[model samples]
Target: SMSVKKPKRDDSKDLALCSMILTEMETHEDAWPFLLPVNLKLVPGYKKVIKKPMDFSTIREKLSSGQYPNLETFALDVRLVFDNCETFNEDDSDIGRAGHNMRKYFEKKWTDTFK
Candidate 1:
């Protein structure tokens, strides 16, 4: 019974696309500081200022464990990492520079895949 099928309402395709872009980001060299959750206690004022901390490892885990329902949730978390980085570090500093590039990569990939 081959026929034109209605698009799946599950959004699995978009979720997979988000995972694909995440893979690109995890492999990027500039992603080091963001690979794992930062030690809030060790980094003074981190816990005080940052409401929430996001990292690639957490993203991957969440992505793998079905914690995200759609690409929107995934994108939100990714942007949080970038925003958190910029919040704590200067634009010219190491982590800030990485965050800028990572955001650039994500926005470009997101636009390319979604539109």
Candidate 2:
């Protein structure tokens, strides 16, 4: 086995913080649509429109696997989850409003946690 790893500063605390925020997202009522990937068969056009689909489950897996380059990358990945939502969903629709709500919740937590 390789005896060493790449150095890019310690991340144990950052990883835990990520988990905390993910938990908040999961527990939020508005998170329902984002808890898992969209059903392609139900919305056939979704596949072509959304280039990079993001969701809580996918983020959890990537977070556990340490796939993100840094805290900034991790933050953006989660934001994209909402950004994509806004693009596909109508602002007056339920899913669209949920995206706005979830993003609001996340941004508040982001500022509070990192500040």
Candidate 3:
């Protein structure tokens, strides 16, 4: 039987850079406040209040370790996480504005870093 070839993986440089950016965002005064609340929404096994914080370090480790098939898949997951903010922040409130700013920062950072 003929064997199928698996695609080659890209180096972790991009993933590392992106993770660094995210890690910085976690500490940024402006980004962190908005991100913290939204981050709770990303966690699993929790109900009403957030029992645990979303693990950005864990995500970076996974990405660096090749847990995902490719960068696009990883990027899409990140996009979805931010996209959920729209659902959480339904009105034009502080939370909504903060979330919008956070998303914009992510997009700009990713674009400038990758492009």
Candidate 4:
């Protein structure tokens, strides 16, 4: 789950900085932002649509260690949560509402998938 505040993106320059971070993030993070202003494939606070890219070796070690259960399921849930949160364009209270709704959607889907 994620949260978005009043966008303390205070200045035009701050907005520009956000834009810059978004641009470079797309190719590297499997996120292409501009295409969809209300992309149904995003997590509220996360800048990119995809996720923090992980190294294969690191992932392999984690899997081998069994520190987590159903890691693939976790990844699937993450993708599903992002996919369902497509219309997350709101400021202040609206942002919080969106997160609440998205979290519910994620929980429902996660339960269904787990079953």
Q: Of the pair 1 and 3, which is ahead by TM-score?
A: 1
lDDT at 98 for candidate 4?
48
Which window of ten consecutive residues has the lowest lDDT sum in model 3? 45-54
Candidate 4: regions farther than 4 A off: 1-92
Each prediction's Cα lDDT score? 0.91, 0.90, 0.59, 0.39
lDDT for each residue of candidate 3 in 1-115, tens digit (9 for 90 to 100): 2686678555658667767776766675555433433343464533453333233454566667878676666666556545555555554777567667766777888788776
Q: Which is superior by lDDT, 1 or 3?
A: 1
Which sections of candidate 1 miss by over 4 Å?
Answer: 1-10
The whole-model C-alpha lDDT of candidate 4 against the native structure comes to 0.39
Model 2, residue 36: C-alpha shift (Å) = 0.5
Clashing pairs in 3: none
Query: Which runs in model 3 stand beyond 4 Å of their true positions?
Result: 1-12, 33-61
Query: Least accurate stretch of 10 residues (summed lDDT) in model 1?
Result: 7-16
Q: Per-residue alpha-carbon lDDT of model 1 for 30-101, expressed as tens digits?
A: 999899999987999999899999999999999999999778889999999999999999999988899999
Clashes of 3: 0
Candidate no. 3 TM-score? 0.60
| lDDT ranking, high to low | 1, 2, 3, 4
Give the top-scoring candidate (lDDT).
1
